[PDB]
Every structure is written in C-alpha cells, then in structure tokens.
Scaffold this motif. Structure first.
Motif, short mmCIF file in Angstrom:
data_model
loop_
_atom_site.label_atom_id
_atom_site.label_comp_id
_atom_site.label_asym_id
_atom_site.label_seq_id
_atom_site.Cartn_x
_atom_site.Cartn_y
_atom_site.Cartn_z
N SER A 51 0.79 -1.15 -0.02
CA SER A 51 0.11 -0.01 0.11
C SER A 51 1.00 1.27 0.09
CB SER A 51 -0.96 -0.22 1.23
OG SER A 51 -1.89 -1.21 1.12
N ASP A 52 2.14 1.10 0.87
CA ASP A 52 2.98 2.36 0.69
C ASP A 52 3.96 2.23 -0.43
OD1 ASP A 52 4.99 4.24 1.79
OD2 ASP A 52 4.74 3.70 3.75
N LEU A 53 4.31 0.99 -0.99
CA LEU A 53 5.06 0.86 -2.24
C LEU A 53 4.21 1.33 -3.46
CD1 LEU A 53 7.19 -0.10 -4.22
CD2 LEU A 53 6.26 -2.63 -3.87
N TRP A 54 3.00 1.07 -3.48
CA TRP A 54 2.12 1.53 -4.43
C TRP A 54 1.82 2.81 -4.47
CZ3 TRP A 54 -0.09 -1.29 -8.77
CH2 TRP A 54 -0.99 -0.57 -9.27
N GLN A 112 -3.99 -3.71 -9.86
CA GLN A 112 -5.10 -2.90 -9.51
C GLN A 112 -6.43 -2.78 -10.46
OE1 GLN A 112 -4.61 1.19 -7.82
NE2 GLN A 112 -3.94 0.50 -5.84
N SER A 113 -7.33 -3.51 -10.07
CA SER A 113 -8.80 -3.18 -10.45
C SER A 113 -9.64 -2.58 -9.63
CB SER A 113 -9.09 -4.63 -10.77
OG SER A 113 -9.68 -5.42 -9.50
N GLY A 114 -9.90 -1.44 -10.13
CA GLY A 114 -11.03 -0.30 -9.29
C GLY A 114 -10.13 0.08 -8.01
N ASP A 115 -10.84 0.02 -6.95
CA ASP A 115 -10.28 0.39 -5.63
C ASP A 115 -9.45 -0.62 -4.97
OD1 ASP A 115 -12.09 2.76 -5.78
OD2 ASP A 115 -13.72 1.66 -4.99
N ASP A 155 7.47 13.14 -10.03
CA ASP A 155 9.15 13.07 -10.03
C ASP A 155 9.39 12.85 -11.31
OD1 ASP A 155 8.20 13.81 -7.44
OD2 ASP A 155 9.66 12.39 -6.64
N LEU A 156 8.80 11.86 -12.38
CA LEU A 156 8.96 11.41 -13.55
C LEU A 156 8.66 12.85 -14.63
CD1 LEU A 156 10.45 9.35 -15.06
CD2 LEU A 156 10.07 9.05 -12.71
N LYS A 157 7.59 13.76 -13.97
CA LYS A 157 7.24 14.93 -14.67
C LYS A 157 6.36 14.38 -16.17
CE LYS A 157 8.75 17.89 -11.83
NZ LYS A 157 7.97 18.69 -11.09
N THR A 158 5.67 13.35 -15.99
CA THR A 158 4.92 12.84 -16.92
C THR A 158 3.09 12.87 -16.58
OG1 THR A 158 5.31 10.48 -15.98
CG2 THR A 158 6.27 11.20 -18.22
N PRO A 159 2.57 13.90 -16.58
CA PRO A 159 0.96 14.08 -16.35
C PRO A 159 0.14 12.88 -17.16
CG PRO A 159 1.73 16.13 -17.63
CD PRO A 159 2.98 14.88 -17.88
N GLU A 160 -0.65 12.20 -16.41
CA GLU A 160 -1.52 11.32 -16.59
C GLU A 160 -0.94 9.99 -17.37
OE1 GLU A 160 -4.35 8.99 -17.15
OE2 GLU A 160 -3.72 9.24 -19.21
N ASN A 161 -0.33 9.30 -16.13
CA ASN A 161 0.50 8.11 -16.45
C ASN A 161 0.60 7.25 -15.10
OD1 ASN A 161 1.95 6.04 -17.73
ND2 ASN A 161 3.07 7.43 -19.09
N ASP A 162 -0.81 6.44 -14.85
CA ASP A 162 -0.94 5.75 -13.64
C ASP A 162 -0.29 4.43 -13.90
OD1 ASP A 162 -3.29 3.80 -13.96
OD2 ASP A 162 -3.81 5.38 -14.76
N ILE A 163 0.28 4.02 -12.81
CA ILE A 163 1.14 2.46 -12.92
C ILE A 163 0.17 1.44 -12.73
CG2 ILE A 163 3.16 3.21 -11.72
CD1 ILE A 163 2.33 2.08 -9.15
N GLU A 164 0.02 0.34 -13.78
CA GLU A 164 -0.69 -0.60 -13.92
C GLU A 164 -0.41 -1.91 -13.16
OE1 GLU A 164 -4.66 -0.16 -15.27
OE2 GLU A 164 -2.64 1.30 -15.77
N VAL A 165 0.95 -2.50 -13.22
CA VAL A 165 1.55 -3.55 -12.67
C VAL A 165 2.99 -3.36 -12.00
CG1 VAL A 165 2.18 -6.10 -12.98
CG2 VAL A 165 0.26 -5.20 -14.45
N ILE A 166 3.38 -4.10 -11.06
CA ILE A 166 4.63 -4.15 -10.44
C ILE A 166 5.15 -5.61 -10.19
CG2 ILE A 166 5.93 -3.44 -8.49
CD1 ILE A 166 3.74 -1.11 -7.88
N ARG A 167 6.05 -5.83 -10.66
CA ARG A 167 6.92 -7.54 -10.83
C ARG A 167 8.29 -7.31 -10.06
NH1 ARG A 167 5.46 -8.66 -16.02
NH2 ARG A 167 7.74 -9.85 -16.28
N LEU A 168 8.06 -7.41 -8.68
CA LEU A 168 9.50 -7.62 -7.79
C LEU A 168 9.86 -9.19 -7.99
CD1 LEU A 168 7.83 -6.21 -4.65
CD2 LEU A 168 9.61 -4.87 -6.09
N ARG A 169 10.79 -9.29 -8.66
CA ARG A 169 11.54 -10.49 -9.10
C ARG A 169 12.91 -10.65 -7.97
NH1 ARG A 169 10.39 -14.22 -13.88
NH2 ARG A 169 10.90 -16.23 -12.91
#
Lengths: 110, 50
Positions: free
Chosen positions: A48-51, A86-89, A61-75
């Motif tokens: 929840s913090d990492l997300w 993340q699906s909805g809430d 901090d990347l200065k990219t407006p409108e670009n939400d993260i979809e997946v994160i794969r910690l190998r």
C-alpha cells in the motif's frame, strides 16, 4: 462464484499465495498456505506504501502528467515473484515460483 | 484474469537462468614445465671436475 477465482489462482502453475487489499489496507481474502491475517496485515502495509509512493512519483517526479502504474513485478533471489495489479479500488499481491522452485516444492511435498 | 496473464508470461522461460553458473573449467590441459632455479659451478680449477 467469487471464491472459485482463488481456487483458479492456486491452479495456475507456480502460484504459492495471493493477498487482496481494500483502498483502506484490510486484507479481503488470502491463501491458507501464506499466513492468514498476521502476514496479510504485514504484507498490506508494505505494498500500500510501495504502490501509493510509486503512483505518486510517476505523476510528479518523472514529470509525466496522466500515466498511472498498472502492474509491479518484484523478482528476487530463490525464485519468488511478487506481482501487484489494481482493478478499481482493490489491489492484490500474487506470489509465483519458477520450474526449479516448483520442482523443489513438489519434492518437499513428496 | 490480469494477474493470470502476468503468471503465464513469466512461466514461458526462466529468463534469469545462467548457463553453467558457478561450475569452473574443471579439466584444463597443463603443459609439463621444468624451471631451472639456480646453477652451481666451481671457479678457476685445473681442468674441469665432473
């Protein structure tokens, strides 16, 4: 119906565990193999913090407006693989293995 | 169904496997050498002495 997907997810090759979170942080449903409520409260605080941190950073901090993260794969070391979607809430954290670790887990079961 | 998609992709190939990880050359050809460390010899003798 909503239980059958949890049964469908353990059926996928490699899948150890899963943990689902509300927008809050409470775990909705977890696997029996991964620890219940004890780890599920622990594993919620981190992701929840990492997300929310990463969600924030990509929009600012990347200065990219409108670009939400979809997946994160910690190998990791061994063969762990922590997938965050993340699906909805709601969100969730699956844990898969690889052929080497799957084979090790089957030998341990045997 | 979105996570099931990501499980499938990673299960195709290990992608982190290193072919012959750790294990060294093992058998390696070693040529037989003979290093001359030091010569001894007599100095200003009448003829040579075997």
């Amino acid at each position: 119906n909503a239980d059958d997907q949890l049964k469908q997810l353990s059926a996928l090759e490699g899948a150890n565990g899963y943990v689902i979170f509300n927008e809050s942080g409470i775990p909705l449903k977890r696997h029996e193999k991964s620890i219940s409520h004890e780890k599920a409260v622990h594993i919620a605080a981190l992701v929840s913090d990492l997300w929310n941190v990463s969600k924030k950073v990509i929009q600012r901090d990347l200065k990219t407006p409108e670009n939400d993260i979809e997946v994160i794969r910690l190998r990791t070391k061994h063969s762990y693989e922590y997938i965050i979607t993340q699906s909805g809430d709601f969100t969730m954290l699956a844990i898969q293995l690889c052929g080497k670790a799957i084979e090790e887990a089957k030998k341990a079961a045997a | 169904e979105g996570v099931e998609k990501c499980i499938y992709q990673n299960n195709q190939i290990d992608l982190l496997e290193e072919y012959f990880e750790g294990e060294t050359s093992e058998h390696v050809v070693e040529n037989l050498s003979s290093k001359t460390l030091m010569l001894f010899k007599d100095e200003k003798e009448i003829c040579k002495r075997s």
